[PDB]
C-alpha cells in the first residue's frame, strides 16, 4: 500500500514549514519560483566546491524567510568544515550569487549557516552517507549496518531504513529494509524526520528512504 510522506502528515502540528514567508495569491507563484531558484543555486555551489575538496557535506535543509526588506537563508548543515575553512567563506561567495539570482530591487539578502550538532540524528545526512558508501560499491548489508551503528551511537530512539533498486547490480530489482527500535508512523504526536534520496549507479538508480523517530 502507499503511506503518506510522514513529513506532510504532521504539518502545523509537530513540524514547521521551511519557507516561512507570506504573499498575496498573485505574487505567490512568483515567490515560489524565487525560492526554487535559490535553493537550486545554493545546492549546486556547495556540491561542486565541497566535492572538489573531497569531503562529506551534509546540507540538511534550507529555510527561507522573506521579509519586505531582507530575505534570509538559513542553511542547516552537518559539517561546515568544507564551507567555512575555504578562503572565500561560503557566506560571501554565495551571498553574491544568490543575490544575483532573485533580484536586487527592494530585496537584499542575508545568509546564515547553522551547525546541526548531531549529524547522524538527521536522516538527510545519513542517507547521503549511505549513498556515498554504495556509490563506492560496498555491499549494501555493510552500508546499512554501519549506518544503524553510527546513528544509534549518535543518540536516536528509532530508525527504519529502506533501499530499493537493482541491488548489487543484479538484474532483477528488489526492496531491502531494516527496522530498528520503535518507529510509529501513524502517531501524529511523534517527532518524525523523514527523507528521500536518489542514487545514480552503473546499474541505474537506487532509492533510499529513511525514517527517524526522536520521541513524543
Amino acid at each position: 500500500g502507499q503511506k503518506i510522506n510522514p513529513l506532510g502528515f504532521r504539518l502545523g502540528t509537530t513540524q514547521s514549514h521551511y519557507s516561512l514567508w507570506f504573499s498575496q495569491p498573485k505574487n505567490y507563484a512568483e515567490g515560489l519560483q524565487e525560492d526554487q531558484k535559490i535553493r537550486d543555486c545554493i545546492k549546486n555551489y556547495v556540491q561542486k566546491n565541497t566535492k572538489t575538496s573531497s569531503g562529506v557535506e551534509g546540507i540538511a535543509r534550507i529555510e527561507i524567510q522573506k521579509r519586505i526588506d531582507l530575505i534570509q537563508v538559513i542553511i542547516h548543515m552537518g559539517f561546515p568544515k568544507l564551507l567555512i575553512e575555504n578562503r572565500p567563506q561560503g557566506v560571501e561567495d554565495l551571498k553574491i550569487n544568490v543575490q544575483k539570482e532573485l533580484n536586487c530591487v527592494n530585496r537584499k539578502l542575508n545568509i546564515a549557516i547553522t551547525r546541526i550538532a548531531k549529524p547522524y540524528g538527521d536522516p538527510n545526512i545519513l542517507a547521503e552517507f549511505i549513498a556515498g558508501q554504495l556509490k563506492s560499491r560496498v555491499s549494501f548489508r555493510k552500508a546499512m549496518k554501519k549506518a544503524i551503528e553510527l546513528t544509534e551511537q549518535a543518540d536516536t530512539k528509532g530508525i527504519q531504513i529502506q533501499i530499493a533498486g537493482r541491488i548489487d547490480g543484479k538484474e532483477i530489482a528488489r526492496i531491502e529494509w531494516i527496522r530498528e527500535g520503535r518507529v510509529p508512523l501513524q502517531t501524529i504526536r511523534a517527532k518524525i524526520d523523514y527523507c528521500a534520496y536518489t542514487v545514480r549507479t552503473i546499474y541505474g538508480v537506487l532509492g533510499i528512504k529513511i525514517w527517524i523517530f526522536m520521541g513524543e
Binding site: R141, E149, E152, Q153, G181
Partner: protein, 187 residues
C-alpha cells in the same frame, strides 16, 4: 537500608542496555567457529515464499573441546551467530591419547546417520568426510579414521560423531570401573 532507586539503578547500570552496547566479545572465549553448511529453507505463506537460512556450525578450540549447534535466521550472518551461541551451550570434551587420537574403535548412531571412528598411527592425519571431518578436526583430534555409513545428512552426522566421541572410555577410567590396575589391562 539504602534507597530503592539507587540500588535498582545499580542493578540497572550493571545489566547494560542492548541498544547502547555493541557486540563483539567472542574471541575472548578462546574459540573458533566453523560454518559447515548453509541452506535456504522455506516457509510458504499466502504471499509467497518466505526464505530463511539454516546454518549448521561447529565450534572447537582445536585443543580437545568441541560442540555442534544449529541456527536459523533471515540473513547468513545472524543464523551463523545463533548457531555459534547454541553450540557454545551444548559443548563436550573428546578423550585424547598422548599422540592426539582415539582411545579405541567406536560406532555411533543418530537417525539414519551411522558413524565409524577408529584410532590411527601418528602421521596419518584425519581422513574422513564433511561433517565427521570438520567436527573431528575442530576438536583437535590429529589422527583418526572415520567413515559415515548409512545416511549423508551433514547435521545428523555431526551429532552422531559427538555421540561417538562422547562414549569413548579412557583407560584410567576402565581401570577405575573394573577395579583393576592399568598394567594388567595393557597386557
Amino acid at each position: 537500608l539504602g534507597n530503592d532507586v539507587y540500588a535498582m539503578d545499580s542493578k540497572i547500570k550493571k545489566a547494560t542496555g542492548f541498544g547502547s552496547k555493541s557486540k563483539k566479545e567472542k574471541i575472548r572465549d578462546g574459540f573458533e567457529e566453523n560454518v559447515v553448511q548453509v541452506r535456504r529453507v522455506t516457509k510458504v505463506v499466502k504471499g509467497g515464499k518466505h526464505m530463511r537460512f539454516r546454518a549448521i556450525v561447529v565450534v572447537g578450540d582445536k585443543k580437545g573441546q568441541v560442540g555442534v549447534g544449529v541456527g536459523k535466521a533471515k540473513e547468513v550472518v545472524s543464523a551463523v551467530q545463533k548457531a555459534a551461541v547454541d553450540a557454545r551451550r551444548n559443548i563436550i570434551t573428546v578423550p585424547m591419547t598422548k599422540y592426539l587420537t582415539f582411545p579405541h574403535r567406536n560406532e555411533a548412531d543418530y537417525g539414519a546417520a551411522r558413524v565409524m571412528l577408529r584410532p590411527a598411527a601418528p602421521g596419518t592425519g584425519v581422513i574422513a568426510g564433511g561433517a565427521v571431518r570438520t567436527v573431528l578436526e575442530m576438536a583437535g583430534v590429529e589422527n583418526a579414521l572415520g567413515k559415515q555409513l548409512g545416511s549423508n545428512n551433514a547435521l545428523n552426522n555431526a551429532r552422531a560423531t559427538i555421540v561417538a566421541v562422547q562414549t569413548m572410555r579412557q583407560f584410567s577410567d576402565v581401570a577405575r570401573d573394573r577395579g583393576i590396575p592399568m598394567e594388567e589391562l595393557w597386557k
